[PDB]
Every structure is written in structure tokens, then in C-alpha cells.
Design a protein around this nucleic acid. Structure first.
Ligand SMILES: Nc1ncnc2c1ncn2[C@@H]1O[C@H](COP(=O)(O)OP(=O)(O)O)[C@@H](O)[C@H]1O
Ligand code: ALF
Length: 951
RNA sequence: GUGUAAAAUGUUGCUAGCAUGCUAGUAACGUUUUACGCCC
């Protein structure tokens, strides 16, 4: 009854018990009765090695299988009677894991005495359980616009701006006279649509303060309007008294548009057109030049001043990203206060009425967009055409989910015939491409093939699948090219390269190709209205790089993205039900996003209360976002609760990194490890791959794993790689490139990290911290012992990236907070196939890749002594003398020792505050603070928490 | 994006026997669940 003592249940425990006994016997069958009333008596003997009480089953049935089942019934009943078998044994039985045992403290008495002296030498008692605007000026002599300062030397110090304007004018006249490649580029730009209303757009801008351009995508407009403004300003011989400032919302888009405008101008990058993306600047000449930058770089430059720039040409606003709307909200008042500035907002296809209404009903210009509506087809249309039904043959939820695929009427074509024949919907197959090919060959429509896959992972998977199906994946006849941010610029520049007809172009891309760039020859668009949704859930610190449906506005744009003049075809892979069911627009990301970084930015520019500023924005954000920004600023001691920016906050604002790494960079110079902190912050915030993985590789190679050395950490590997790269860069790069390739170095990532380290140390120098601590602290990896610099660097790392720590159980299988299973990313140095146990069973990662908290990246072993030092914002005490870390980690330490360790929590903040207050003398601290530095260097040593008992 | 053993279904052919059928299994088949152990 209670143990469901029947045949097809409760037998799992019996099977396991017999497996433990290894008895391979079964039921012997004996016939009883005639052939018309046949019965079988089955026998089985079971030996019990634990109770020494052998049992037997002798039961009858209508057949051999029935006899065996009847015997097993009585066997389970007798095993229960024996009180040795486990009851129930249903289909519900899992196997999980938890903490086994740490090395809780077990320190030497020296460190205990040091900690006691520190807690008594610093008196840290613990209990044992207004709206102004940024000034702007017109162009001025001896003043550089880019650097926002006075050059006071060179040529402008003695040369008037009018002379520079005349020089630019004569140079452009000579270029008009002779530059033939410029002639062909300008004729291409003239046949380009915007050159229709050249003068018109050159005048409307002077007419009004706020100017909105509106014209369908693919006009080649961003790369032309700024150049036309410069040309108009220089044709009057005034190019010196004019500069152009443009902001894109994506880094790679900014790089691409800068390269395009340089190539069309037939000029080397950095002469008259330059770009300043985060951690990279190629600033051009100070006068008569164009600047492209991301919104973040402009928000950074806003601190100094917009002096010396003529017109600002803010790019795509339909993105609705937080940065662009913040910039627009500031720029509204900026251009209202100063009537001599010209703000330009650019869109692609959006009801710009709200944008115009925001700026006091500003003019909404228009571009004549030649177009031809394209044939739009859906899943019913494609099932009518060439079959569409089959496919490749918190946990859950409620009934609120509606499957529109299964809610429809079968008034369409032979749905059952298509189902019984074939199809492949979720994964594309020969069907779609062959249908397009036959449509082209029968209706005579040679044209490019365009698809919008949501993510780079799916892009790579489908590219590999189509390469496997190379009969129709034949690049010689069916050219295939991806397009995404991650891939190098070589693929982007190859995409634009045309191919002869017959070599069909099948472009695989994502939301990037919907704007920014546009291929002229696109005819047929195969949309799936799927896009990446890399959302960070800061309310619980879970990442989700999932895929979500595109908005109806975006879907309409994609429908219009193809078919310039040719008919064009839209092969939408969705039903009309979902087509009309999804939201018309896209949810404003500004509504749901933490605003701590923007709060620090607004407090840096002394723009008054954040609440009032957010009220006077495009969309009044919900009070939760401003409240959470306030909470983060108050708890992190960047901004006081009384809207008073402490020097810590002002220092953090200038840092081009998130505050969670600025808090580490502050302490980096405190403990004489600033180089390590700069390198780690650059390698962490700038999400990048450490090593150049070769094709067909599933793990890290021999040297790729040996570079981490005895430390066996990817962060230590990166540090030593940077050290060897810089000592090699001390020599020539001709052999350095092949050496880095041999060492599996990413080269470009290393350059980025080095430049970021240089910029961070320059910023720290400007802050006031001494140069002496900013010296090389070279760490070797072959040493398996201890090194104070490296262990304090790792302790600071664990301080910063909280709560991205994890507990290792076995192989890839690791545990994360709230007891979540996870694996180790392939790029990590801790990837292998054999079972290895690490010296310390605690790891901290950088990123949580893949939505279902599975992939962890940037793993590095951490000392078991973090506990309360650098492991959390909260520590607790559990039963049976257990210290609780992040409510998912257990240590076994005396409450007195736990309180002693936890008393350091206010001390860290006090040290940070003192370091920020007096940057000039961080090396020469107060004597209790020198003792604190000494004790923290002593405590975080790798082989420290093992005294008394190594176990 | 996987294999092993166990159990319910029906199936392929065969087997010992009974007044064309029948009483039982056999080797194999796929389905569904169970755990065992991989790789992302
Ligand atoms: N790398 C390039 N080489 C040549 N022409 C380009 C390049 N990139 C863009 N163009 C042209 O410039 C135009 C750019 O349009 P775009 O910047 O997307 O305008 P908007 O952003 O207003 O839609 C396109 O029509 C395209 O033909
Ligand atoms: F210039 Al755009 F989207 F129109 F980047």
C-alpha cells in the first residue's frame, strides 16, 4: 500500500539491490495443467549477504512472463517483510551535490595576532553573533576642439582661423580640379538619393535650431550628410570656423562609418575624419574635421566642454537606447541655451512626430525615397507554394502562453500532403533555398539573398550546416557571407564586394544589417523576426543571451529592407496571427535598465537632481530605476544620499569602466598592485577572448594551458601573456606577429588590453596617485609557491567581480549561487577531458554565458580565505558552527574568528575613502593603515589558510 | 546534437501441444519510463 507493492513499481529498489548482490539468476518455469488451461510455476532464490536470511519466490501465472511478474510481486512483498528493501521507488529520484568541506581558516597564530592588533590598532568594533549647462564657445584661436584645451603651441598659436579656412577651401578646390577617384566618389554620392536636396538640407539646418531628417534606410545618408555640411561650410571659405560631431550607438558601426567616410573622401583616416570609440581614439586635425564617436565617448567629453565644434549630427535615434536618449535630453537644453548651435537628429523610418514635438515642433524634413513594395509571404503562403509543416524530429509555466501555429483553420492548401512529404522549419533546409532558386529561374529575378538570424551562435551553426550541405552550400554558385560585430572587419568589407551573376549571394546577418549598412542588390529577404536579447537581470544577477520576436515596427522595416526598385520578396516565416499579435513597437530599454552609471554621469556634469532631469526626458522612467540607481550610489559610496558627490564618485565617473571595476582600480594602487588591477579590469570589462583558437579546436592546446602555469588561472595567463607581449613589442612586430600566432595570442585583444591599461594608469596619474606604485610587478607562473603581488591581485579580483564566484564539484560540473548547475566555457584554461582536482575548490568567473546559467567564462582559482574579506556584501552564521557566504557557501569556523574576519568590512570602505580623499600620498599612509595593508597582504597569500592542519 | 540494463505495448517469422483455428514462449523490432556513464 504505502510502498506500492505491485509489479510495475517498487521494483527499481529490488533491481538495485540485486545489482549490489550481482545475482544473475531468474525465474525457472515449470508447466502445470493441460494445454487448454496452461499455467507456469516460476521459481527464484534470493540471497541476502546483509541479514543472512535467504528467501524464495514460487508463484504461478498464465504464462512465463505472467509467472515472472507474479513471482516478482511476492518477491517485493517478502523483501518488504524482511525490512531490507526500500519502499515507493517511483519515477522520482534525483542525485544532486552540495558543499563537502572547506579549509575554513586554520591559520597560523601570527596572522591571528596581526588581525587582533589591526582591529585594536584601528578601533573597528564588531559584534560577534544647480541644473546648469555645459559651457560652449564658438571656434577660437589657439584652442583645440578635440582635446578641449589650449594647444598654446604649433601653428594655430600664430595662425588665424581664417587662414586655415582659406587653406581648406583652396585644398578642396584643387581636389575638385584633379582628384579623379574623388570625382567618381562624388558622382556616386550625387546619384545617391540625398544629393537631390543638397542645398535644401544645407539651408533648413541654418533655418532652425533643431533639425530632423527623415528618409528610408539604405540612402547612404549618415556617410553623406556630415560631409555635405562640411562642404557647404568650406565652399564659403569658412571651413576653419566649423567642426562636425556625430554619434553612433555601436562601436563597430562607428568604425565602419569612419572608414567609409575616409575612403570616400580619399583621405587617410585621422586627417579630416576621425573616430573616438571607447578605449580608442584617432583624433583628426583640430580645425575643419569630422568626428565620429559612440554616445559614451560624447558623454565623457561632455565633462570638459563642447567648445570649438560647429554642428552635432546625432545619428539613428530609433534605437531608443539609454545613451542616445540621455544625449538627446541634454542636447535639447544645450541647443536651447545657445542659439548658435545646430543639432541634427537622423532617423530611418519612424513616425518622427513625437521627436519634432519634443523640440518645440521642429521641422521634419523628408528625402525622396524611390521604392517598390515587395511580395510578402507567410507560413500559409509557403505551405501553399513548396510545403510547410514538418521540422527536424520557471521550468515550464502557465496557460497564458498562446501557440498561434496550432490555432488556425485548414482553409489553405494541402497541409496534410506537405506534412506527410517533408519540411524543415526551425532549421532551414534545401526547401527554402531551392524554392527561391526555382522562383528566380522561372520568373527571371536574379538578386541577392538576405536572411536575419537572431544570434551569432545560430549564424555559425547554420553556416556550418549549409557548408555540410555544400551541394546547395556551394559558395562558387551560392556565395555565403556572415555579418556581425564579432567577426573581423575583413568579412564586413568582403560583404560589400559584388560578385558576378549566377554566383548568388546568400547574406547571413542580424539586426546589424537592418541599419548602419545596406547592400544595394538585396531582393529577397528571408526574415524570422528573431533578435538577440542579451539582458542582464540585476534584480537577481542572472544573464540571458536569448532570442525574442522582433517588433512589428522592426518587422515592417525588414519587410521594407529589401526591394529597392526590383519587385522584391518578403519570405516571413510567421503566421498572420503572430504577425498581428505581437507588440507594434519595441519596449523602451530605458524603462527597464539599471541607471547607476547614468546617475554617476549626470552627477559628474553637475546637472542637478536626477529625478527632475529624468522627468524632463523623452519618456519619464519608472521610479524603480532611479531608486535603484540611488541605492547603488549610496551603498557604493560614490554619491552620498544628500546628492553630494564624494571624491570617490567623481573619480569613478571619469573612469571608462563600470563602478564594480573602479572600486578595484582604487585599491589597485593602495596595495602596490596597480598594474595588475589595470590589466584585469581591462580584460574583464572589455569582453574579449584571451587566445586565438584555431579552427576545429575543442579545448586549449598544450602551451595554451601551460601559459597559466602552476597558477593555472586564465587571468594569470593573461597577465603573463601581456608581459611577454610587451617585452616582445620592445622588439619588432614582423616576427612578433608570427610569435603571437605560435603562442595562440589574439594580438588585437592584447593591443586593446594594453591601451586600456595605459589609459587607466594615465587617468590615475591625473587623479593624483603617485607614479611610483604604477610600476611593473611581473608575476611568474612556473612558481607553485606564493607571491604576494599575485595573490593580492587575485583577492582584489574576487572583490570586484562579486557575485560571479562558483564552487567546483567535478569536471565541467560546477555549482553557482542558489545551487545552479553550470559548465566551464571552452576558451577557459580549465577545460580538459580527464578528471582533475584543483588545489583550491573555489572559482570566480567573469561572465554567465547562455541564458540557462550554464556557461561560465573567465574562471580563476581563488583562495579559500576570501570568506568576508573579498567574497560578498553579506556574511552570516549557520548552525553547527557554519559561516554562510552568499547564502550558498559553507565554512566551519569559530564565531569569534568569523567576527574578526568580518570586522574588515568597514575597513575596506574606509581605506577606499581615504585613498580617494588624498591621492597624492596613498603610498605613505597612516600607521594603522600601513598595518592594514601589511595584514591584508599577509592574509590573502595563496598558501595561508592551511596552518595547524593541511586537511 | 548520446550508448548500456530493466519494465508495458503491439509487431516480424519460428517453436511444443490442442478441435482452418487455438494454448504458451522464442530471436528481433519500434514505442514509453527508469536509473547507469558521456559532451556542450
Ligand atoms: N562601405 C561603404 N562603401 C560604399 N558605400 C557605402 C558604404 N557604406 C554605406 N554606403 C552607402 O551610403 C549609404 C549609407 O546609408 P545609411 O548610413 O544607412 O543612412 P541611414 O543611416 O540614414 O539609413 C548607403 O546607401 C550605402 O549605399
Ligand atoms: F545611420 Al543609422 F541606423 F540610420 F545608423
Amino acid at each position: 500500500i504505502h510502498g506500492n507493492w505491485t509489479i510495475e513499481n517498487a521494483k527499481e529498489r529490488l533491481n538495485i539491490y540485486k545489482q549490489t548482490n550481482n545475482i544473475r539468476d531468474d525465474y525457472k518455469y515449470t508447466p502445470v495443467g493441460p494445454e487448454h488451461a496452461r499455467s507456469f510455476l516460476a521459481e527464484l532464490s534470493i540471497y541476502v549477504p546483509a541479514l543472512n536470511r535467504t528467501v524464495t519466490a514460487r508463484e504461478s501465472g498464465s504464462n512465463k512472463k505472467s509467472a515472472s511478474k507474479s513471482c516478482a510481486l511476492s518477491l517485493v512483498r517478502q523483501l518488504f517483510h524482511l525490512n531490507v528493501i526500500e519502499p515507493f521507488s517511483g519515477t522520482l529520484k534525483k542525485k544532486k551535490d552540495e558543499q563537502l568541506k572547506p579549509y575554513p581558516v586554520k591559520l597560523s597564530p601570527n596572522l591571528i595576532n596581526k588581525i587582533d592588533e589591526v582591529i585594536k590598532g584601528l578601533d573597528l568594533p564588531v559584534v560577534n553573533p544647480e541644473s546648469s549647462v555645459i559651457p560652449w564657445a564658438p571656434p577660437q584661436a589657439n584652442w583645440n576642439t578635440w582635446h578641449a584645451c589650449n594647444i598654446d603651441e604649433g601653428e594655430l598659436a600664430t595662425t588665424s582661423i581664417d587662414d586655415l579656412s582659406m587653406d581648406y577651401e583652396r585644398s578642396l578646390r584643387d581636389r575638385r580640379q584633379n582628384d579623379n577617384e574623388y570625382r567618381q566618389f562624388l558622382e556616386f554620392r550625387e546619384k545617391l538619393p540625398i544629393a537631390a536636396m543638397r542645398s535644401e538640407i544645407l539651408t533648413a539646418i541654418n533655418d532652425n535650431p533643431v533639425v530632423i531628417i527623415r528618409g528610408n534606410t539604405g540612402c547612404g545618408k549618415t556617410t553623406q550628410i556630415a560631409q555635405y555640411i562640411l562642404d557647404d561650410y568650406i565652399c564659403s571659405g569658412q571651413g576653419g570656423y566649423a567642426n562636425i560631431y556625430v554619434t553612433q550607438p555601436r562601436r563597430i558601426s562607428a568604425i565602419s562609418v569612419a572608414e567609409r567616410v575616409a575612403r570616400e573622401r580619399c583621405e587617410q583616416l585621422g586627417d579630416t575624419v576621425g573616430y573616438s570609440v571607447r578605449f580608442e581614439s584617432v583624433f583628426p586635425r583640430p580645425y575643419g574635421a569630422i568626428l565620429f564617436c559612440t554616445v559614451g565617448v560624447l558623454l565623457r567629453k561632455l565633462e570638459a566642454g563642447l567648445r570649438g565644434v560647429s554642428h552635432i549630427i546625432v545619428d539613428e535615434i530609433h534605437e531608443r537606447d539609454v545613451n542616445s536618449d540621455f544625449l538627446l535630453v541634454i542636447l535639447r537644453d544645450m541647443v536651447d541655451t545657445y542659439p548658435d548651435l545646430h543639432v541634427i537628429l537622423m532617423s530611418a523610418t519612424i513616425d518622427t512626430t513625437k521627436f519634432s514635438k519634443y523640440f518645440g515642433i521642429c521641422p521634419v524634413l523628408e528625402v525622396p525615397g524611390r521604392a517598390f513594395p515587395v511580395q510578402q509571404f507567410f507560413l500559409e503562403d509557403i505551405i501553399q507554394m513548396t510545403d510547410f509543416v514538418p521540422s527536424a524530429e520557471s521550468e515550464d509555466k502557465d496557460e497564458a502562453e498562446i501557440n498561434y501555429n496550432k490555432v488556425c483553420e485548414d482553409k489553405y492548401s494541402q497541409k496534410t500532403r506537405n506534412a506527410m512529404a517533408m519540411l524543415s522549419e526551425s532549421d532551414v533546409s534545401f526547401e527554402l533555398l531551392e524554392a527561391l532558386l526555382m522562383h528566380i529561374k522561372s520568373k527571371n529575378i536574379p538578386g541577392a539573398i538576405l536572411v536575419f538570424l537572431p544570434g551569432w551562435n545560430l549564424i555559425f551553426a547554420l553556416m556550418k550546416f549549409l557548408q555540410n550541405t555544400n551541394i546547395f552550400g556551394d559558395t562558387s554558385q551560392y556565395q555565403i557571407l556572415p555579418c556581425h560585430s564579432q567577426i573581423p572587419r575583413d568579412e564586413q568589407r568582403k560583404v560589400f564586394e559584388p560578385v558576378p551573376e549566377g554566383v548568388t549571394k546568400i547574406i547571413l546577418s542580424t539586426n546589424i544589417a537592418e541599419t548602419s549598412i545596406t547592400i544595394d542588390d538585396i531582393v529577397f529577404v528571408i526574415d524570422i523576426c528573431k533578435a538577440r536579447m542579451k539582458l542582464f537581470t540585476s534584480h537577481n544577477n542572472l544573464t540571458s543571451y536569448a532570442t525574442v520576436w522582433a517588433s512589428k515596427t522592426n518587422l515592417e522595416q525588414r519587410k521594407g529592407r529589401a526591394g529597392r526598385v526590383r519587385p522584391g520578396f518578403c519570405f516571413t516565416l510567421c503566421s498572420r496571427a503572430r504577425f498581428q499579435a505581437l507588440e507594434d513597437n519595441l519596449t523602451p530599454e530605458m524603462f527597464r535598465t539599471p541607471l547607476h552609471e547614468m546617475a554617476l554621469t549626470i552627477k559628474l556634469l553637475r546637472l542637478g537632481s536626477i529625478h527632475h532631469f529624468l522627468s524632463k526626458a523623452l519618456e519619464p522612467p519608472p521610479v524603480d530605476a532611479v531608486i535603484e540607481a540611488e541605492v547603488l550610489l549610496r551603498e557604493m559610496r560614490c554619491l552620498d544620499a544628500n546628492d553630494e558627490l564624494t571624491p570617490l564618485g567623481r573619480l569613478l565617473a571619469r573612469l571608462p569602466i563600470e563602478p564594480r571595476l573602479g572600486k578595484m582600480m582604487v585599491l589597485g594602487a593602495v596595495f602596490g598592485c596597480a598594474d595588475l588591477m589595470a590589466i584585469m579590469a581591462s580584460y574583464s570589462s572589455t569582453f574579449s577572448e584571451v587566445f586565438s583558437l584555431d579552427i576545429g579546436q575543442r579545448r586549449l592546446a598544450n602551451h595554451q594551458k601551460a601559459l597559466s602555469g602552476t597558477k593555472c588561472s586564465d587571468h594569470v595567463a593573461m597577465i603573463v601573456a601581456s608581459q611577454m607581449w610587451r617585452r616582445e613589442k620592445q622588439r619588432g612586430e614582423h616576427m612578433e606577429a608570427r610569435f603571437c600566432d605560435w603562442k595562440g595570442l589574439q594580438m588585437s585583444t592584447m593591443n586593446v588590453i594594453w591601451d586600456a591599461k595605459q589609459q587607466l594608469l594615465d587617468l590615475l596619474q591625473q587623479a593624483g596617485f603617485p607614479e611610483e606604485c604604477m610600476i611593473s610587478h611581473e608575476v611568474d607562473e612556473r612558481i607553485d609557491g606564493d607571491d604576494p603581488v599575485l595573490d593580492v591581485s587575485l583577492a582584489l579580483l574576487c572583490l570586484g567581480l562579486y557575485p560571479n564566484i562558483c564552487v567546483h564539484k567535478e569536471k565541467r560540473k560546477v555549482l553557482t549561487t542558489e545551487s545552479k548547475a553550470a559548465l566551464l566555457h571552452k576558451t577557459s584554461v580549465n577545460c580538459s577531458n580527464l578528471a582533475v582536482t584543483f588545489p583550491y575548490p573555489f572559482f570566480v568567473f567573469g561572465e554567465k554565458i547562455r541564458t540557462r546559467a550554464v556557461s561560465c567564462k573567465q574562471l580563476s582559482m581563488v583562495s579559500p580565505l576570501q570568506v568576508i574579506l573579498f567574497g560578498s556584501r553579506k556574511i552570516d552564521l549557520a548552525a553547527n558552527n557554519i559561516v554562510r557566504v552568499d547564502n550558498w557557501l559553507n565554512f566551519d569556523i569559530e564565531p569569534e574568528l568569523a567576527a574578526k574576519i568580518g570586522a574588515l568590512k568597514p575597513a575596506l570602505e574606509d581605506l577606499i575613502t581615504v585613498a580617494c580623499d588624498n591621492p597624492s600620498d596613498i603610498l605613505r599612509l597612516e600607521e594603522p593603515y600601513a598595518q592594514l595593508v601589511k595584514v591584508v597582504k599577509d592574509l590573502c597569500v595563496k598558501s595561508a589558510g592551511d596552518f595547524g592542519l593541511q586537511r
